[PDB]
Amino acid sequence: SKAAADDFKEAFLLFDRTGDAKITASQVGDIARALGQNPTNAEINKILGNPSKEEMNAAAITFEEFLPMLQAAANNKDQGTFEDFVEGLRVFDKEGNGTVMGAELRHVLATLGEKMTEEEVEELMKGQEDSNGCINYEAFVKHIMSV
Amino acid sequence: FDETEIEDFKEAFTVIDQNADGIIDKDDLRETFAAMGRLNVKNEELDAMIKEASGPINFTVFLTMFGEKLKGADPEDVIMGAFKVLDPDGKGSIKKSFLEELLTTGGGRFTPEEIKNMWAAFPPDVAGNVDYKNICYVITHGEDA
Amino acid sequence: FDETEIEDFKEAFTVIDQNADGIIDKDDLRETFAAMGRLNVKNEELDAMIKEASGPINFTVFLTMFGEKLKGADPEDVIMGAFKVLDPDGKGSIKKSFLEELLTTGGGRFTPEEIKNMWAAFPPDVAGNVDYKNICYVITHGEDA
């Protein structure tokens, strides 16, 4: 709205590697996340196809399409409730203390639903899981929502 | 510009300014080259060095000319800092394809063609991204060591 | 000529120039040979070394004389680079007949007669093309190790 945030246009100049002021359709998922929006990858996929837009063939972009797609994704930020994120992992391990065994969270984050690479899974556990093999998800989900 | 790097340029300015008056003229350039072994140094090379300045080469004109050509010059300890963050487990030289992918995919300065020029005199190990350290040496002091 | 190879020739020039004035004369040649154990070094050997130069042996005359005799001299890391491309799976020394066929059939410098001279002091393994690495050693530093 501007509140006209012109820093979204300045961040588009940091993600366009050619400097022509266009951003390919394959970058739009990760740049919506870097502007403070977490649409799921199936949602980013649907919307695209919904608009008869094929992410399979070469793509370019213009700021005039990327701005309204970020504004259509911005209504879905009401789905980001931290009660359900901590209660999900609280149902994932027994006893009254928030600890996932290391390999349980790593294999679930790579193979269940939207596949996260094991390189990204190791980069998200690095520091929050110590050598006991127990990830405290009270501080883990706190630090994941700090970015 | 750190102060020891500016003192290194002050020592190089004094070795090329053999009249010790504070201004490197064309005779100082020719007599420093003749003392390094250049008996055939042409006057057109000395004139092309003086044509890069708008005035006489005193210490601040030599510092501003080197500043404007070395606007991305990085000391060896900060280049090894960044390469220790790229190899955060220490000791190992990082893979060739990992440096090619991370140069391109992060920045436009890491585009490929430029990566072929990086491999081209920075040899294999250096180019590949396996060794490490020899490239920090030749970025702070050029030519083969 | 890489710069560390030129620094190795500067250190060898300083060990043969025992007067430390920058010019290796015939007395320096004889006193370096006597300090290595050559008590019978003839004056005709010293005169044949000086007869390869047109002037006194200063550092740039010694570098140009070694440059003109070593116009295909290759450092050990680039010889092992080429032998790792000939054995691209790593570890194994390459076959005798494979190096004889690939030397001949690619280039005139790899003709046979020359291949018999390669096997002749570069022993079997080396000659054969099975070992590897000892030949890179003796091409950068001669004689049996």
Report whether C28 belongs to an annotated binding site: yes
Can you name the residues that pair with A99 across neighbouring β-strands? A136
3-state secondary structure chain A: CCCCCCHHHHHHHHHCCCCCCCCCCCCHHHHHHCCCCCCCHHHHHHHHHCCCCCCCCCCCCCHHHHHHHHHHHHHHHHHCCHHHHHHHHHCCCCCCCCEEEHHHHHHHHHHCCCCCCHHHHHHHHECCECCCCEEEHHHHHHHHCCC
Q: CA-CA distance, A40 to A44, in Å (whole number)?
A: 6
Q: Give the alpha-carbon dihedral of C102, B97, A55, A36, to 10 degrees.
A: 180
Residues annotated within a binding site of B for Ca(2+): 17, 19, 21, 28
Identity of the amino acid at C130: V
What are phi and psi for residue C24, nearest 5 degrees?
-75, 110
Q: What does the H/E/C string look like for chain C?
A: CCHHHHHHHHHHHHHHCCCCCCCECHHHHHHHHHHCCCCCCCHHHHHHHHCCCCCCECHHHHHHHHHHHCCCCCCHHHHHHHHHHHCCCCCCCCCHHHHHHHHHCCCCCCCHHHHHHHHCCCCHHHHHCCCCCHHHHHHHCCCCC
From A17, which residue of chain B is nearest by alpha-carbon distance? B108
Strand, helix or coil for residue B80:
helix
Q: Helix axis angle, B96-104 relative to B112-119, nearest 10°?
A: 140
Contact (CB<8Å) C81/B124: yes
What are the C-alpha distances in Å from A38 to residues A28, A114, C142? 12, 13, 66
Residue A17, chain B, CB below 8 Å: the answer is yes
User: How was this model experimentally determined?
Assistant: cryo-EM
Kindly report the backbone phi and psi dihedral angles of residue A15, in degrees, each rounded to the nearest multiple of 5, phi listed first. Answer: -105, -15
CA–CA distances in Å: residue C129 to residues B79, C77, C114, C115, C141 = 40, 17, 14, 11, 19
Please report, for residues A110, B62, C43, C134, the alpha-carbon distance to residue A48 in angstroms, rounded to integers and kept in the order given.
24, 57, 89, 62
N-terminal to C-terminal alpha carbon distance within chain B: 24
Residue with tokens 């010694």: C62
B24 φ/ψ angles, rounded to the nearest 5 degrees? -75, 110
Query: CB of A141 within 8 A of CB of A86?
Result: yes
Size of interface B-C (CB pairs under 8 A): 10
CA quadruple A128, A131, A136, A140: dihedral, nearest 10: 10
Q: Which residue has the tokens 């989900």?
A: A141
Residue A75 touches chain B, beta carbons under 8 Å: no
